[PDB]
């Protein structure tokens, strides 16, 4: 089947565990195969790069490292709180994610 | 659907192949089951020339390995075609 994952690309999340616990950012990318996400400005690693074209000075570059998807919590755009995700069926027949606290949509 | 364009696969790029261009000889990779009569027809409707001679030969695939795994490249077949005097295949010419 499919990798059921509670967050999606483009939504704001809270890092609730680990070194960067308490930080807030936007999901850059989602890695269902690794069950991981990438959050802007979070979990920056230093990577050694060789001297070459497009890396003339070599040295080190900085990149975000993926986080396990259970460490992030989506933030409601209505009540502004981290929350669990509920399913709400719309009168037009579509299904959307809603915040488990106040019921607001999560897009 | 089999056509003339399924018979001719690609040109052969080598010094030996380039040498025959001056004499009107052109080397192609062709379908391994294609016959000389089949090949001669295919070149005529693909490049609009007159073909007067077709030579063929089988090219067995080389055994190659990547790390631990042994295998083989696919078998191939190339054809050298001689066009009528004065005629040219401008797609191959210029390389």
């Amino acid at each position: 089947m499919r990798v059921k994952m509670h967050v999606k690309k483009g939504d704001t999340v809270l890092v609730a565990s680990g070194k960067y616990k308490g930080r807030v950012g936007k999901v850059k990318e989602v890695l269902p195969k690794k069950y991981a996400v990438i959050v802007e400005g979070v979990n920056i690693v230093k990577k050694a790069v060789r001297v070459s074209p497009k890396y003339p000075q070599g040295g080190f570059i900085e990149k975000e490292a993926p986080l396990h998807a259970s460490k992030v919590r989506p933030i409601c755009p209505a009540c502004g709180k981290p929350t669990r995700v509920r399913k709400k069926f719309l009168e037009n027949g579509k299904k959307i994610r809603v915040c488990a606290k106040c019921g607001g949509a999560l897009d | 659907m089999k056509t003339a364009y399924d018979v001719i696969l690609a040109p052969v790029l080598s010094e030996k192949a380039y040498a025959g261009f001056a004499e009107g000889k052109y080397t192609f990779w062709v379908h391994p089951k294609a016959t000389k009569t089949e090949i001669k027809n295919a070149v005529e409707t693909a490049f609009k020339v007159k073909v007067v001679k077709v030579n063929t030969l089988h090219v067995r695939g080389k055994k190659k390995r990547l790390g631990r795994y042994l295998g083989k490249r696919p078998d191939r077949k190339k054809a050298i075609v001689q066009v009528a005097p004065g005629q040219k295949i401008e797609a191959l010419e210029g390389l």
């Binding site: - | 659907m1 056509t3 364009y5 399924d6 001719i8 696969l9 690609a10 040109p11 790029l13 693909a46 797609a91 390389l95």
Partner: protein
């Protein structure tokens, strides 16, 4: 090829006749041969074109075969 273009190609082909579908298939096969020549001499950067054209020929043959079976 976009999803909308695929629907257009299938819609146009179903309006044709078996004689026309064979002629269109042959022109597409000729176009694919010219791509293979370009890709052989390292002059096709957009290598995705080869897969797009191959699936188009499969679509036209699938539609042609449906018309043959009535």
């Amino acid at each position: 090829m976009k999803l909308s273009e695929v629907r257009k190609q299938l819609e146009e082909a179903r309006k044709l006749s078996p004689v026309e579908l064979e002629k269109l298939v042959r022109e597409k096969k000729r176009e694919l041969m010219e791509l293979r020549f370009q890709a052989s001499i390292g002059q096709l950067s957009q290598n995705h074109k080869i897969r797009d054209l191959k699936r188009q020929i499969a679509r036209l043959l699938t539609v042609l075969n449906e018309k043959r079976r009535q």
